[PDB]
Amino acid sequence: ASRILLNNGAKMPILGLGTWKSPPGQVTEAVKVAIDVGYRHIDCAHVYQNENEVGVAIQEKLREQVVKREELFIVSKLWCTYHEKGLVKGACQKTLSDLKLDYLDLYLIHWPTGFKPGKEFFPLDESGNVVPSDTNILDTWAAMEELVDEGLVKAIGISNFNHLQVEMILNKPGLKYKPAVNQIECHPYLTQEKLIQYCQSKGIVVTAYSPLGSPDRPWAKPEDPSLLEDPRIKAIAAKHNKTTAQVLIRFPMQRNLVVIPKSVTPERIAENFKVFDFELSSQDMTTLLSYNRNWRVCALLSCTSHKDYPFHEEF
Ligand SMILES: NC(=O)c1ccc[n+]([C@@H]2O[C@H](COP(=O)([O-])OP(=O)(O)OC[C@H]3O[C@@H](n4cnc5c(N)ncnc54)[C@H](OP(=O)(O)O)[C@@H]3O)[C@@H](O)[C@H]2O)c1
Ligand SMILES: O=C(O)Cc1nn(Cc2nc3cc(C(F)(F)F)ccc3s2)c(=O)c2ccccc12
């Protein structure tokens, strides 16, 4: 099926459009094209600085009656500088205002690490270390739970939480709502078997980000691995008469993951959606899993001393 049941009883489309790095000038048309060709899930964040322009598209398509709001699954995320309890509602309300929505389908704690509040997204000390906030993830979660109880969001979740962090939420004293989703980096170079099996065993749906290896990440280097140019992946695509990107989006779908490829290129937006008409074989799946190398796109150096940095640990 094209949608997966979450623990809040709502259904989530397993293919969504990513919006990180989509320039503000091109993301409105990008989202329009996406909705036009089938996408019903959009992955957003305040930190991406383009939620206004995303919302312009959603609103035009709602006004145009191309789609109904109930048919849309719009995801945003709470940025690290707003983990304080007094700041969570306003952060969510800013996002809703910019997206031109009265609710989000899903609102994630974006990273487990809280940073000092201020106008700066990445407040640093004079030596380049991120300035933490003394907020912890459990209190941030109570704040997220309040958003459900106020009708601003239909589901809450986390993002970039390791197994021990997930476990801390599930084991939170007085837990009122379990997390619906954990959104983590996942592709054939970072396969996450252990963390995914842990989350799924607990009824937490996993969304895979950077499924193409985020070739437009601004810190990419010549010697980094490249998924889209991996001849072993290209061969698998050739076998199926599909593109390499199509294989890389179908791969997580078959692991019962949600996947959110980003493009602002209309022909790639459409290509990326044409992944429901073919199957990878079990052997194809194990073969792609074998390319794991624990290679991470998203793991900023300046953040490695935060007490709650999620990637020292095994998973
Ligand atoms: N939770 C978090 O911490 C977190 C972190 C990272 C990402 N995410 C979410 O996940 C989304 C996807 O990850 P991502 O943006 O890092 O990268 P991605 O989706 O792995 O890669 C996007 C890059 O691939 C290109 N591309 C897309 N389709 C292609 C195709 N069919 N053939 C060739 N190239 C193609 C895009 O180019 P064009 O755009 O020029 O077409 C862009 O350069 C984000 O945008 C964001 O919504 C969340
Ligand atoms: O955030 C996205 O969606 C994409 C994303 N990733 N990264 C790499 C990051 N690595 C982190 C590591 C931690 C850590 F938790 F590990 F400390 C905390 C926060 C971050 S941001 C960025 O620096 C970034 C900057 C602007 C907009 C989006 C991003």
Swiss-Prot record:
EC assignment: 1.1.1.21, 1.1.1.300, 1.1.1.372, 1.1.1.54
User: What's the superkingdom here?
Assistant: Eukaryota
- Name the chemical reaction catalysed here: an alditol + NADP(+) = an aldose + NADPH + H(+); all-trans-retinol + NADP(+) = all-trans-retinal + NADPH + H(+); 9-cis-retinol + NADP(+) = 9-cis-retinal + NADPH + H(+); 13-cis-retinol + NADP(+) = 13-cis-retinal + NADPH + H(+)
Site residues by UniProt (Lowers pKa of active site Tyr):
K77
Phosphoserine, modified sites? S2
| Main location group | cytoplasm
N6-acetyllysine modifications at: K94, K221, K262
Q: Which InterPro entries match?
A: AKR (IPR020471), Aldo/ket_reductase_CS (IPR018170), NADP_OxRdtase_dom (IPR023210), NADP_OxRdtase_dom_sf (IPR036812)
Q: Please tell me one Gene Ontology term that the record gives under cellular component.
A: extracellular exosome
- Result of altering Y48F: Complete loss of glyceraldehyde oxidoreductase activity
Q: What does this protein do?
A: Catalyzes the NADPH-dependent reduction of a wide variety of carbonyl-containing compounds to their corresponding alcohols. Displays enzymatic activity towards endogenous metabolites such as aromatic and aliphatic aldehydes, ketones, monosacharides, bile acids and xenobiotics substrates. Key enzyme in the polyol pathway, catalyzes reduction of glucose to sorbitol during hyperglycemia. Reduces steroids and their derivatives and prostaglandins. Displays low enzymatic activity toward all-trans-retinal, 9-cis-retinal, and 13-cis-retinal.
Subunit: Monomer.
State the similarity comment: Belongs to the aldo/keto reductase family.
- Quote the protein name from its UniProt record: Aldo-keto reductase family 1 member B1
The organism is Homo sapiens
Query: Where is the organism placed in the taxonomic lineage, from the top?
Result: Eukaryota, Metazoa, Chordata, Craniata, Vertebrata
